[PDB]
Design a protein around this motif. Sequence first.
Motif, mmCIF file in Angstrom:
data_model
loop_
_atom_site.group_PDB
_atom_site.id
_atom_site.type_symbol
_atom_site.label_atom_id
_atom_site.label_comp_id
_atom_site.label_asym_id
_atom_site.label_seq_id
_atom_site.Cartn_x
_atom_site.Cartn_y
_atom_site.Cartn_z
ATOM 1 N N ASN A 102 0.891 -1.336 0.098
ATOM 2 C CA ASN A 102 0.007 0.129 0.064
ATOM 3 C C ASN A 102 1.003 1.538 -0.151
ATOM 4 N N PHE A 103 0.889 1.981 -1.129
ATOM 5 C CA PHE A 103 1.865 3.193 -1.215
ATOM 6 C C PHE A 103 0.795 4.434 -1.092
ATOM 7 N N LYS A 104 1.245 5.458 -0.451
ATOM 8 C CA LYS A 104 0.327 6.371 -0.059
ATOM 9 C C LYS A 104 0.677 7.713 -1.137
ATOM 10 N N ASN A 105 2.045 8.120 -1.266
ATOM 11 C CA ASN A 105 2.471 9.375 -1.944
ATOM 12 C C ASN A 105 3.122 8.850 -3.277
ATOM 13 N N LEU A 106 2.533 9.306 -4.511
ATOM 14 C CA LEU A 106 2.992 9.313 -5.696
ATOM 15 C C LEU A 106 3.512 10.620 -6.151
ATOM 16 N N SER A 107 4.753 10.441 -6.412
ATOM 17 C CA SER A 107 5.478 11.675 -6.500
ATOM 18 C C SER A 107 5.848 11.670 -8.350
ATOM 19 N N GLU A 108 4.894 12.637 -8.763
ATOM 20 C CA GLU A 108 5.311 12.775 -10.191
ATOM 21 C C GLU A 108 6.479 13.950 -10.569
ATOM 22 N N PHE A 109 7.122 13.716 -11.778
ATOM 23 C CA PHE A 109 8.245 14.702 -12.013
ATOM 24 C C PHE A 109 7.985 14.633 -13.481
ATOM 25 N N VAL A 110 8.608 15.881 -14.113
ATOM 26 C CA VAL A 110 8.694 16.202 -15.443
ATOM 27 C C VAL A 110 9.957 17.135 -15.558
ATOM 28 N N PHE A 111 10.633 16.685 -16.425
ATOM 29 C CA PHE A 111 11.984 17.464 -16.645
ATOM 30 C C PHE A 111 12.066 17.758 -18.220
ATOM 31 N N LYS A 112 12.551 18.858 -18.301
ATOM 32 C CA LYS A 112 12.520 19.521 -19.848
ATOM 33 C C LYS A 112 14.237 20.036 -19.741
ATOM 34 N N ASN A 113 14.691 20.306 -21.317
ATOM 35 C CA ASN A 113 15.729 20.922 -21.542
ATOM 36 C C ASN A 113 15.414 22.047 -22.806
ATOM 37 N N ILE A 114 15.189 23.109 -22.312
ATOM 38 C CA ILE A 114 15.072 24.189 -23.592
ATOM 39 C C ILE A 114 16.374 25.325 -23.273
ATOM 40 N N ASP A 115 17.295 25.415 -24.334
ATOM 41 C CA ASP A 115 18.372 26.578 -24.011
ATOM 42 C C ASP A 115 19.061 26.172 -22.946
ATOM 43 N N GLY A 116 19.041 24.859 -22.651
ATOM 44 C CA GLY A 116 19.678 24.304 -21.209
ATOM 45 C C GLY A 116 18.992 24.556 -19.789
ATOM 46 N N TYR A 117 17.777 25.182 -19.887
ATOM 47 C CA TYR A 117 16.952 25.349 -18.726
ATOM 48 C C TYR A 117 16.262 24.258 -18.384
ATOM 49 N N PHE A 118 17.005 23.542 -17.154
ATOM 50 C CA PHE A 118 16.555 22.284 -16.837
ATOM 51 C C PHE A 118 15.234 22.334 -15.765
ATOM 52 N N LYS A 119 14.490 22.729 -16.387
ATOM 53 C CA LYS A 119 13.099 23.013 -15.405
ATOM 54 C C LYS A 119 12.719 21.340 -14.714
#
Lengths: 50, 361, 254
Positions: C150-167
Motif C-alpha cells: 500500500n503506497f500513499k504518496n505518488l511523486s510525479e516529475f517532469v523534466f525538460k531542457n530548452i536552451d539548457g534550462y533544466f526545468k
Amino acid sequence: GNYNYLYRLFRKSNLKPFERDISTEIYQAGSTPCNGVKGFNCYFPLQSYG
Amino acid sequence: TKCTLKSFTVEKGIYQTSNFRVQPTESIVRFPNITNLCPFGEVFNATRFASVYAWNRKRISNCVADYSVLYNSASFSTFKCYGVSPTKLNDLCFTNVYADSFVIRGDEVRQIAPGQTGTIADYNYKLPDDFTGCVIAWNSNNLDSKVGGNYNYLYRLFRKSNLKPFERDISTEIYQAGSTPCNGVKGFNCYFPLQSYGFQPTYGVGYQPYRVVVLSFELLHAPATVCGPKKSTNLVKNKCVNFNFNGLTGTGVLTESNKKFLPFQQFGRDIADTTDAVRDPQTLEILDITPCSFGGVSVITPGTNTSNQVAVLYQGVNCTEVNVFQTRAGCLIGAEYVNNSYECDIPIGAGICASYQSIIA
Amino acid sequence: QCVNFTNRTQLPSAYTNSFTRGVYYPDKVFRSSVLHSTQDLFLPFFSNVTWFHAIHKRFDNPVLPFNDGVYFASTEKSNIIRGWIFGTTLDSKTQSLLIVNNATNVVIKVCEFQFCNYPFLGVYYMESEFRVYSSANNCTFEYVSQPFLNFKNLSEFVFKNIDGYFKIYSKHTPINLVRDLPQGFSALEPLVDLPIGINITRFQTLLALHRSGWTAGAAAYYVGYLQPRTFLLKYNENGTITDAVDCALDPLSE
Ligand SMILES: *[C@@H]1O[C@H](CO)[C@@H](O[C@@H]2O[C@H](CO)[C@@H](O)[C@H](O)[C@H]2NC(C)=O)[C@H](O)[C@H]1NC(C)=O
Ligand SMILES: *[C@@H]1O[C@H](CO)[C@@H](O)[C@H](O)[C@H]1NC(C)=O
Ligand SMILES: *[C@@H]1O[C@H](CO)[C@@H](O)[C@H](O)[C@H]1NC(C)=O
Ligand SMILES: *[C@@H]1O[C@H](CO)[C@@H](O)[C@H](O)[C@H]1NC(C)=O
Ligand SMILES: *[C@@H]1O[C@H](CO)[C@@H](O)[C@H](O)[C@H]1NC(C)=O
Ligand SMILES: *[C@@H]1O[C@H](CO)[C@@H](O)[C@H](O)[C@H]1NC(C)=O
Ligand SMILES: *[C@@H]1O[C@H](CO)[C@@H](O)[C@H](O)[C@H]1NC(C)=O
Ligand SMILES: *[C@@H]1O[C@H](CO)[C@@H](O)[C@H](O)[C@H]1NC(C)=O
C-alpha cells in the motif's frame, strides 16, 4: 609619433546628431568628484592618437 | 473641432476630436530581494597571496556581481580597463567570472596588459590580444614590507619558450641557457629559474610591492548566471503610473487585489492574454492592473452660424479623473443638465441628448 | 567504490496506460475561469509508458535517453528512490549531473564525474553506504535546496531542457493503489529552473539498496516520454489546472 589629434574617449552623456562638443572640462569617472582638479579616477577627456 | 474637420465653419453636431489619456506620474522599477552577494571578501581581501607564476584562479559564479564597492574603494591605487567600460559594469551579465590574484613590484604593473612583452609576461602570465576585464592593484607597503625579507612571493624568471595565453606553470626544472649538458644538476651555466622579490622597508616609490587581483570574463553560450545589481524603488498604489515588475513594463493603476495566486505565479492574464494582476516580488502581494482612464473626447457644438459655445464629452471617463455632469456615456463638461425632456437634438448616448436653447443636457 | 551485482534475475519490463496524468503548468501565469490552449512538449494522454520494478529478486537500473523531455512517476514508500543522474556519457569525458537526497538535504552538483556501471545507495537494517562514484575530479556548478520527499504518496516529475534550462516539475499526489496509477486529475506545479546549458542526452535513476545479501524493497516507478503537441487546459476559479484535453488524442478532443 604624431600626437596632434585627440578623441573624446569619455563623455557623461550622449551626443545629438550634428552637434559638436568642445567643452574641455574634467570627467568625473568615480563616485568622489574631481573637484575641478585632475586626480584619481579623473583624466583629460581627449586622448592623443598613438 | 475646426482643425480636425479641416474647416473654419462647423455644423451642429457632436464630433470626436481627440483622445483623453491619463498620463503616468512616475516610473516604478521593482525587482526581487537583493541577496546572495559575491563573496569577494575571501578573494580580493584575503590574508595570504600567491606568486605570479602560481596565481590562484577563483571562480566567481552564480552571484550578483556588485562592482560599486570594488570600483569606489580608495585603498585600490589604480583602476584600469582595456575593453570594457568601468561605469557600465552594473548593467552587464556574464556566464562566469575568472578571479585571479598575484603579487608584482611597482614597475611591473605596466606589464599586466594585452600583448605586453616584459620579464614577467613571457614566463609567468601572458594575456591574449583581445583581453577583457579590469585590473585592480594597490600598494601593500603596510603589510608586505618586512625587514627580514619577503622571499615567499616568487616569480618565474626564465623558461625555454614563451607562454601561450592563460598558461600556468608549476614545474621546477633547471634552465639551460648554454650548450653545456645538464641533467637537472646545477653548474657554471645552469641555475634555478625562480627568484625572490626585493620588498624592503627602505625602498620608496617605484620599488614598492603592488598586490594585483585581476577579474576576467567569459561570455560563452552558457546562460548568464552572473549578473549585475538591480534597483527596486518604492511602490505606488491607486495611481496611474508606469511600472516595471521583473521586466513586465507598462502603464496602469495598481490596487490591492483579493485574487489568490498560486505560490509560483508571478503574473496574471485575462481571457484576451493581457496582464491584469502581478505578484509583487519584494513583498508577496497581488496587485490588480486597471488600465488608465482613456477615452475619446467629443465636442458638442451647435453650428458656428449660431454660437461659439461648445460642450466637451469625455467618453467612458468618470468625472473625478478629468456644468460637470456624469452621464453613463461619460463625463460631460460645459452642459447644464436640466430636468426637462425635449426631442433629441445632439445625441450624447444612454438617453441623454444635448441642445442649444447656453448648451443644455 | 564500484561493486558489481552477480545476483540478477531476468524478467521483461512491465507496461501500463498513462491515463489522464502528466499535466504540468506551462508557465508561471495566473489564469482564472479561462480555457487556455498551449503548444508545449507534454506527456500525451493515454500514452505508452515504460514500467520498471524492484522486488525481493529483480533490479531495474537502466540508462534511458532523455529524448526531448522525460516524465517520471513513482508510487513509492520508505524512500527507495532518492535521486537522479543526468549526462551524456556519465564518465570522465563529458560533464554529468548529480541528484542525491539524504538526511541532510538534496544535492544538485553539476560535475564531470566517472560513474560506476551500477551506482546505488545503502539502507542496512540509516544510510552508511556511500558508493555512488569511485572518484571525483572536477566541479563547475553546484546547487542546494530542500528535500522533496500500500503506497500513499505518488511523486510525479517532469523534466525538460530548452536552451539548457533544466526545468523540474512535481506535485504531491495521495494514492491508494498498490501497483497501477489512480484515476483522476492533478496538475504538476514547478519547482526551480536550472540554467546550466550543457549537453544532456541520457539519464539514470539512483536506488537505495536494503540489507537484511542485499535486500530489495517493493518499488514501482515509471518513465514517461514527452512529445510536442497542443493541450487545452481548463483553469478553475482559484487558478489551478483542474482539467486538460489532448488536442491530438481523438477527434472529439480535437
Ligand atoms: C561491473 O561490470 C561491468 C560490466 O559487466 C564492468 O564494465 C567493464 O569492465 C571491464 C573490466 O575492466 C572493462 O574491460 C569494460 O570496458 C567495462 N565495460 C565498459 C562498457 O566500459 C565494470 O568494470 C564492473 N565493475 C567493477 C568494479 O569491476
Ligand atoms: C574587503 O573587501 C570586501 C568586499 O566586499 C569587504 O566586504 C571587506 O569589508 C573588505 N575588508 C575590509 C577590512 O574592509
Ligand atoms: C524581502 O524584502 C522585503 C522588504 O522588506 C521583506 O519584507 C521580506 O521579508 C524579504 N524577504 C522575502 C523572502 O521576501
Ligand atoms: C508499449 O510498447 C511495447 C513495445 O514498445 C509493447 O510491448 C506494449 O504492448 C505497448 N503497450 C501499450 C499499452 O501500447
Ligand atoms: C548526505 O550526503 C552528504 C554529501 O556530501 C554527506 O556530506 C552527508 O554526511 C550525508 N548525510 C549523512 C547523514 O550521512
Ligand atoms: C578535470 O580534471 C583533470 C584531472 O582530474 C584535469 O587535468 C583537468 O584540467 C580538469 N578540467 C577542468 C575543466 O577543470
Ligand atoms: C551531445 O552528445 C551527443 C551524444 O553523446 C552527441 O551526438 C552530440 O553531438 C553532443 N552535443 C554537444 C553539443 O556536445
Ligand atoms: C477555491 O477556493 C475556495 C476558498 O476560497 C475553496 O472553498 C474551493 O474548494 C477552492 N476550489 C478548488 C477547486 O480548489
